Amino acid sequence: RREIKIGDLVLGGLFPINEKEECGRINEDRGIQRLEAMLFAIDEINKDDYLLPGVKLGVHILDTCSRDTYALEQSLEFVRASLPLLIAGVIGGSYSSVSIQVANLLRLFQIPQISYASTSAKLSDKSRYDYFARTVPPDFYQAKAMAEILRFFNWTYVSTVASEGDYGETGIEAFEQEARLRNISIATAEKVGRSNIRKSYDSVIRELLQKPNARVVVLFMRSDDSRELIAAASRANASFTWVASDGWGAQESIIKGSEHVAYGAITLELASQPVRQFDRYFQSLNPYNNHRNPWFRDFWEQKFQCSLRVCDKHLAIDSSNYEQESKIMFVVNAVYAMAHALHKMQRTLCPNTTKLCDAMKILDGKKLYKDYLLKINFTAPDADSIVKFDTFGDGMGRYNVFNFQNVGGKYSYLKVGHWAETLSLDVNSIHWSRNSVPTSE
Ligand SMILES: *[C@@H]1O[C@H](CO)[C@@H](O[C@@H]2O[C@H](CO)[C@@H](O)[C@H](O)[C@H]2NC(C)=O)[C@H](O)[C@H]1NC(C)=O
Ligand SMILES: *[C@@H]1O[C@H](CO)[C@@H](O[C@@H]2O[C@H](CO)[C@@H](O)[C@H](O)[C@H]2NC(C)=O)[C@H](O)[C@H]1NC(C)=O
Ligand SMILES: COc1cccc(C(=O)N[C@H]2C[C@@](N)(C(=O)O)[C@@H]3[C@@H](C(=O)O)[C@@H]32)c1
Ligand SMILES: *[C@@H]1O[C@H](CO)[C@@H](O)[C@H](O)[C@H]1NC(C)=O
Ligand SMILES: [Ca+2]
């Protein structure tokens, strides 16, 4: 159990820095990189003369270990005081089950919360999650997006595999409704997960195979389940055309060591433009300059398969081993959205000072969330670039459609489409099959 404690007002941070003894493997892109996007954002605001000057932001950043129980154990730190550092708002978590588990504790103490990745439609329930907001859309849209992809290609008989829990179940139920409207019948609907209600990944692949007419299999699954289902498929000589949600997205980790069985996959992911300034930041970090991050050496030891095999002192994060994670944009926006609301509240309460006046000493969370956090700023570095929340505190339903191919020896994810309110595709760009040399024996 490590942490990042640094400010006049402090922000809580929650990231899945670790994965599966249920913490033991670093999450390089969705963990380490995301954490550092919050650290970059806090340094940037703390230098911004126009946004929140005279009020320096500090942090309390904690690991969720990709589990809601761990996340809740961790979140007690942000509320121990109200039972030493006084947390204004919480940035995180990533995963919907975590974000839900945290929101349950944080609403009791009136702490605003902003997720940069939790897409579960369950979180749009403002009666229940009255202190939660997110820079991402609900999966009501992603399900409609995927349904529309099937409709376009006339995928009339498909199967579904979904993760149990707060992301997959809600996810696939919307898909099921969206499919029903577009005259799409589900061949087999299976569910995967830790509980004893669920079949094995090998049993699920068998249920998909025992339905030969369904070549397309829709996935509303987490990354761990996605990696496991793909492995079970490889272990069965099963070749399906996967259409997967952001849980899989454009991630190499899911497909690593099982490239052949996933070839021709169509994965979604939220529409984002890389924050170029952050590219310079991350790349500048190394295990000798970055002391503020307690997990950074474990990350560095992992990414480079060496010890601190011994690492080379001259090693660096660069274009040869790095590409900005798809949702980094959303991490920065979540930090900035929090910072803008605090600025609005201060300009009201303390108009004759930049500083945190007597009127803003005891923070009113209910006022901070409802009267302020529902703001409008142009995303910090054309028209759909403004950070805002709907009445339910959700972000905009905008997605990029990807295709898993072999460009010429190197496996990668190519953008083949987008979803705004309607769908668009570059059909000629998509590769549905592996370019495998014929066999003559
Ligand atoms: C998807 O299906 C539609 C039909 O629902 C295809 O469009 C044509 O629709 C007219 C309707 O009067 C038919 O007469 C044509 O025969 C259809 N074309 C074909 C080739 O089936 C549409 O082309 C299909 N699109 C894809 C990409 O599969
Ligand atoms: C396929 O889905 C459509 C959804 O609208 C079903 O409804 C038809 O919609 C068109 C709209 O242009 C109408 O002209 C038809 O009269 C509708 N059909 C009926 C029976 O209401 C459509 O029925 C579905 N396909 C089939 C063959 O049932
Ligand atoms: C590894 O353990 C878990 C546990 C729970 C979820 C997942 C998971 O992969 N969840 C996916 C879907 C997600 N949009 C969501 O959870 O709401 C965020 C997406 C992302 O962060 O980019 C994860 C993994
Ligand atoms: C700011 O200062 C002026 C004195 O010139 C005072 O009248 C005004 O009430 C002050 N505003 C607040 C909210 O303290
Ligand atoms: Ca500042």
XYZ file of C-alpha atoms in Angstrom, residues 3-432:
430
model
C 0.159 6.636 -2.096
C 0.812 10.135 -3.632
C 0.152 12.888 -1.000
C 1.384 16.414 -2.021
C -1.778 21.991 -1.595
C -4.457 24.544 -0.336
C -7.288 22.349 -1.736
C -6.651 18.601 -2.309
C -8.038 16.196 -4.949
C -8.448 12.478 -4.442
C -7.173 10.221 -7.221
C -8.135 6.581 -7.992
C -6.492 4.451 -10.730
C -6.157 0.700 -11.403
C -2.316 0.920 -11.032
C -2.356 -2.863 -10.252
C -4.082 -6.022 -11.576
C -3.830 -9.813 -10.704
C -2.240 -11.733 -4.507
C -4.907 -9.701 -6.437
C -2.293 -6.850 -6.827
C 0.897 -7.973 -8.433
C 1.000 -6.826 -12.069
C 1.118 -3.130 -13.116
C -1.463 -1.719 -15.564
C 1.021 0.327 -17.699
C -1.513 2.295 -19.832
C -4.781 2.318 -17.882
C -2.904 2.651 -14.575
C 0.531 4.302 -14.647
C -0.076 6.518 -17.705
C -3.511 7.606 -16.402
C -2.118 8.441 -12.945
C 0.564 10.612 -14.602
C -2.095 12.398 -16.715
C -3.628 13.647 -13.393
C -0.132 14.646 -12.118
C 0.552 16.590 -15.391
C -2.913 18.283 -15.164
C -2.351 19.385 -11.495
C 1.115 20.870 -12.411
C -0.496 22.662 -15.354
C -3.379 24.247 -13.315
C -0.855 25.174 -10.537
C 0.968 27.214 -13.266
C -2.302 28.673 -14.839
C -2.510 32.436 -13.980
C -6.157 32.550 -15.243
C -7.476 29.249 -13.793
C -7.610 28.934 -9.997
C -4.551 31.149 -9.048
C -3.795 31.746 -5.347
C -5.279 28.252 -4.625
C -2.685 25.512 -5.103
C -4.053 21.987 -5.711
C -2.563 19.025 -3.849
C -3.316 15.304 -4.366
C -4.152 12.071 -2.550
C -3.706 9.434 -5.211
C -4.409 5.750 -4.463
C -4.413 2.407 -6.337
C -7.728 0.472 -6.706
C -6.007 -2.888 -7.572
C -8.686 -3.293 -10.319
C -11.214 -4.363 -7.522
C -14.115 -2.543 -5.789
C -13.416 -3.920 -2.243
C -9.791 -2.680 -2.408
C -11.055 0.633 -3.853
C -13.516 1.033 -0.918
C -10.782 0.106 1.625
C -8.689 2.862 -0.055
C -11.560 5.431 -0.270
C -11.896 5.372 3.583
C -8.668 7.392 3.600
C -10.479 10.285 1.810
C -13.189 10.230 4.578
C -11.192 9.233 7.739
C -11.008 12.992 8.550
C -14.820 13.498 8.610
C -15.011 10.650 11.277
C -5.964 14.523 8.249
C -6.121 15.891 4.646
C -9.527 17.361 3.596
C -10.463 16.119 0.072
C -12.452 18.592 -2.083
C -13.299 16.091 -4.866
C -12.285 12.651 -6.250
C -10.900 11.888 -9.740
C -11.573 8.207 -10.491
C -12.000 5.362 -10.651
C -11.598 3.796 -14.053
C -13.771 0.726 -13.797
C -17.552 1.049 -13.233
C -17.731 -1.423 -10.330
C -15.006 0.681 -8.533
C -16.602 4.023 -9.419
C -19.973 2.651 -8.095
C -18.383 1.290 -4.883
C -16.617 4.621 -4.258
C -19.718 6.804 -5.096
C -21.597 4.873 -2.390
C -19.097 5.963 0.256
C -18.417 9.489 -1.110
C -22.084 10.606 -1.383
C -22.438 10.130 2.482
C -19.711 12.822 3.006
C -20.876 15.050 0.079
C -17.679 14.641 -2.018
C -18.052 15.345 -5.824
C -16.626 12.520 -8.007
C -15.575 12.533 -11.689
C -14.738 9.389 -13.669
C -12.564 9.487 -16.784
C -13.498 5.863 -17.958
C -16.530 4.370 -16.073
C -19.143 4.108 -18.845
C -21.913 2.153 -17.016
C -25.400 3.486 -17.609
C -26.080 2.590 -13.858
C -24.036 5.742 -12.951
C -26.479 8.033 -14.843
C -28.971 7.293 -11.979
C -28.827 10.700 -10.185
C -31.230 9.623 -7.469
C -28.592 6.982 -6.388
C -25.280 8.608 -7.660
C -26.092 12.217 -6.684
C -22.381 13.215 -6.277
C -20.995 11.470 -9.412
C -20.171 13.032 -12.811
C -18.040 11.706 -15.629
C -16.141 13.037 -18.728
C -17.255 9.943 -20.615
C -20.661 8.915 -22.094
C -22.983 6.128 -20.788
C -22.971 2.760 -22.619
C -26.526 3.423 -23.834
C -24.685 5.012 -26.853
C -21.889 2.408 -27.264
C -24.570 -0.343 -27.426
C -26.505 1.703 -30.074
C -23.164 2.269 -31.945
C -22.368 -1.506 -32.022
C -25.978 -2.392 -32.950
C -25.720 0.066 -35.900
C -22.420 -1.555 -37.028
C -24.217 -4.957 -37.172
C -27.215 -3.406 -39.031
C -24.971 -1.780 -41.681
C -23.121 -5.089 -42.477
C -26.485 -6.930 -42.130
C -25.319 -9.148 -39.199
C -28.806 -10.502 -38.565
C -27.830 -13.599 -36.485
C -25.188 -12.871 -33.830
C -24.146 -14.166 -30.444
C -23.245 -12.242 -27.285
C -20.723 -12.829 -24.435
C -20.798 -10.366 -21.501
C -18.974 -9.823 -18.238
C -21.105 -10.042 -15.112
C -20.980 -6.877 -12.993
C -21.896 -3.238 -13.469
C -20.272 -2.715 -16.918
C -21.096 -5.809 -19.043
C -24.629 -6.685 -17.854
C -26.102 -3.186 -18.399
C -23.907 -2.898 -21.546
C -25.249 -6.015 -23.287
C -28.871 -5.406 -22.125
C -28.865 -2.061 -24.033
C -27.227 -3.858 -26.998
C -30.005 -6.524 -26.795
C -32.689 -3.739 -26.941
C -30.899 -1.859 -29.770
C -30.497 -5.152 -31.720
C -34.263 -6.000 -31.237
C -35.259 -2.662 -32.861
C -32.981 -3.334 -35.888
C -34.496 -6.872 -36.447
C -31.285 -8.527 -35.036
C -31.684 -11.895 -33.308
C -29.223 -13.119 -30.675
C -28.178 -16.725 -31.425
C -26.713 -17.294 -27.942
C -26.325 -14.936 -25.017
C -23.661 -16.007 -22.573
C -22.286 -14.373 -19.393
C -18.766 -14.721 -17.931
C -17.313 -13.822 -14.526
C -16.017 -14.866 -11.072
C -19.423 -15.956 -9.687
C -20.530 -19.617 -9.593
C -23.610 -18.719 -11.703
C -21.320 -18.418 -14.780
C -19.895 -21.094 -17.133
C -16.128 -21.457 -17.883
C -14.582 -19.619 -20.841
C -14.155 -23.127 -22.440
C -17.846 -23.878 -21.845
C -18.816 -20.454 -23.379
C -16.723 -21.057 -26.563
C -18.514 -24.442 -26.794
C -21.928 -22.672 -26.582
C -20.822 -20.240 -29.372
C -19.492 -23.149 -31.551
C -22.698 -25.247 -30.940
C -24.410 -22.313 -32.852
C -22.511 -22.359 -36.218
C -24.794 -19.845 -37.996
C -23.476 -16.972 -35.666
C -20.047 -15.944 -37.089
C -20.228 -12.519 -35.358
C -19.924 -12.444 -31.552
C -20.672 -9.173 -29.700
C -18.534 -8.556 -26.601
C -19.413 -6.282 -23.654
C -16.631 -7.470 -21.435
C -13.848 -6.325 -19.158
C -10.164 -6.604 -20.291
C -9.418 -9.592 -18.016
C -12.420 -11.537 -19.291
C -11.669 -10.381 -22.910
C -8.077 -11.728 -22.623
C -9.384 -15.045 -21.172
C -12.206 -15.591 -23.732
C -9.741 -14.938 -26.613
C -7.311 -17.493 -25.020
C -10.142 -20.140 -24.723
C -10.991 -19.488 -28.387
C -7.320 -20.100 -29.441
C -7.471 -23.365 -27.394
C -10.504 -24.578 -29.499
C -9.600 -23.731 -33.192
C -12.575 -21.289 -32.972
C -12.423 -18.319 -35.359
C -15.190 -15.720 -34.893
C -15.630 -12.125 -35.992
C -15.537 -10.218 -32.703
C -17.289 -6.872 -32.296
C -16.067 -5.660 -28.878
C -16.789 -2.651 -26.603
C -14.174 -0.229 -25.033
C -13.326 -2.853 -22.342
C -11.319 -4.455 -25.167
C -10.928 -1.160 -27.200
C -7.650 -0.621 -29.104
C -5.483 -2.447 -26.470
C -2.468 -4.661 -27.361
C -2.473 -6.397 -23.932
C -5.818 -8.192 -24.633
C -4.618 -9.638 -27.981
C -0.942 -10.300 -26.946
C 0.114 -13.926 -27.642
C -3.244 -14.711 -29.346
C -3.034 -12.406 -32.452
C -4.249 -15.112 -34.938
C -7.546 -15.911 -33.120
C -8.510 -12.152 -32.875
C -7.531 -11.189 -36.449
C -10.296 -9.148 -38.122
C -11.810 -7.989 -34.787
C -13.876 -4.764 -34.758
C -13.407 -2.962 -31.445
C -14.811 0.269 -30.203
C -13.282 2.937 -28.097
C -14.297 6.444 -27.066
C -13.468 9.265 -29.478
C -10.345 11.134 -28.353
C -7.529 13.358 -29.705
C -4.088 12.888 -27.963
C -3.032 15.698 -25.564
C 0.323 16.440 -27.283
C 1.749 18.387 -24.283
C 1.318 15.239 -22.093
C 3.312 13.191 -24.727
C 6.353 15.413 -23.887
C 5.628 14.971 -20.140
C 5.387 11.107 -19.959
C 8.406 10.636 -22.241
C 10.497 12.955 -19.963
C 9.812 10.670 -16.939
C 12.388 7.975 -15.944
C 13.210 6.128 -12.625
C 15.746 8.864 -11.636
C 13.696 12.096 -12.001
C 10.213 10.820 -11.032
C 10.360 10.486 -7.225
C 6.747 11.651 -6.624
C 5.344 8.388 -8.103
C 5.870 5.340 -5.713
C 4.695 2.802 -8.326
C 6.866 4.218 -11.217
C 9.890 1.839 -10.606
C 7.630 -1.233 -10.597
C 6.128 0.035 -13.874
C 9.603 0.714 -15.377
C 10.879 -2.762 -14.244
C 7.807 -4.355 -15.938
C 7.736 -2.354 -19.288
C 11.417 -3.058 -19.840
C 11.692 -6.629 -18.337
C 14.681 -5.707 -16.090
C 15.883 -4.969 -12.504
C 16.802 -1.680 -10.723
C 18.556 -8.789 -16.281
C 19.650 -5.232 -15.339
C 18.130 -2.028 -16.909
C 20.175 0.355 -19.114
C 20.546 3.823 -17.440
C 19.943 5.390 -20.944
C 16.446 3.789 -21.387
C 13.436 6.087 -22.153
C 9.682 6.298 -22.947
C 9.548 7.269 -26.691
C 7.621 6.599 -29.982
C 9.355 3.135 -30.227
C 7.699 1.931 -26.972
C 4.862 4.454 -26.326
C 1.558 5.723 -27.744
C -0.761 7.892 -25.606
C -3.533 5.758 -24.062
C -6.989 6.381 -25.722
C -8.682 7.902 -22.570
C -5.828 10.228 -21.346
C -7.776 13.221 -22.790
C -10.668 12.338 -20.338
C -8.315 12.087 -17.279
C -7.032 15.684 -17.964
C -10.656 16.929 -18.525
C -11.890 15.391 -15.288
C -9.110 17.196 -13.299
C -9.781 20.491 -15.191
C -13.605 20.229 -14.782
C -13.099 19.914 -10.974
C -10.623 22.871 -11.047
C -13.042 25.092 -13.086
C -15.958 24.523 -10.607
C -13.636 25.458 -7.677
C -12.669 28.625 -9.585
C -16.371 29.577 -10.158
C -17.214 28.954 -6.417
C -14.175 31.062 -5.328
C -15.040 33.951 -7.774
C -18.468 34.040 -6.075
C -17.547 33.532 -2.341
C -14.165 35.385 -2.431
C -14.529 38.169 -5.115
C -12.073 40.533 -3.395
C -9.212 37.796 -3.346
C -7.529 34.950 -5.375
C -6.934 33.132 -2.053
C -9.231 30.684 -0.208
C -11.138 33.231 1.945
C -12.996 32.563 5.256
C -16.278 31.881 3.293
C -14.626 28.941 1.400
C -12.884 27.348 4.491
C -15.659 24.764 5.154
C -16.459 23.477 1.605
C -20.103 22.848 0.662
C -19.940 19.709 -1.501
C -23.721 19.763 -2.397
C -23.287 23.370 -3.707
C -19.911 22.421 -5.385
C -21.484 19.520 -7.383
C -24.957 20.901 -8.363
C -24.345 24.663 -8.623
C -20.785 24.582 -9.966
C -19.378 21.231 -11.351
C -22.109 21.552 -13.997
C -19.855 24.170 -15.910
C -18.574 24.789 -19.564
C -14.827 25.192 -20.543
C -13.012 24.629 -23.891
C -10.815 21.471 -23.425
C -7.324 22.465 -22.196
C -4.364 21.345 -24.381
C -13.142 22.547 -32.977
C -16.769 22.759 -31.632
C -17.168 19.320 -29.884
C -14.044 20.396 -27.831
C -16.016 21.852 -24.885
C -16.037 19.986 -21.535
C -19.626 19.970 -20.183
C -22.006 17.551 -18.407
C -25.599 16.653 -19.248
C -28.342 16.822 -16.572
C -27.181 13.288 -15.450
C -23.538 14.452 -15.233
C -22.456 12.291 -18.253
C -20.199 13.071 -21.207
C -20.924 12.940 -24.952
C -21.660 9.741 -26.919
C -18.796 9.857 -29.504
C -16.833 6.691 -30.461
C -14.080 5.561 -32.827
C -14.442 2.173 -34.616
C -11.238 0.097 -34.927
C -10.002 -2.931 -36.857
C -7.338 -5.458 -35.773
C -4.991 -6.138 -38.746
C -1.424 -6.957 -39.938
C -0.190 -3.747 -41.679
C 2.953 -5.524 -42.964
C 4.453 -7.696 -40.220
C 3.250 -5.488 -37.329
C -0.160 -6.059 -35.688
C -2.082 -2.823 -34.899
C -5.498 -1.081 -34.549
C -6.604 1.128 -37.497
C -9.486 3.675 -37.317
C -12.178 2.461 -39.760
C -15.059 4.610 -38.457
C -16.751 6.897 -35.910
C -20.149 7.225 -34.169
C -21.515 10.778 -33.386
C -25.302 10.294 -33.311
C -25.146 8.416 -36.655
C -22.465 5.928 -37.921
C -19.740 6.307 -40.619
C -17.328 3.674 -42.021
C -14.338 3.356 -44.386
C -15.404 -0.242 -45.472
C -12.477 -0.527 -47.949
C -9.986 -0.082 -45.018
C -11.372 -3.082 -42.996
C -9.632 -6.497 -43.126
C -11.905 -9.433 -42.127
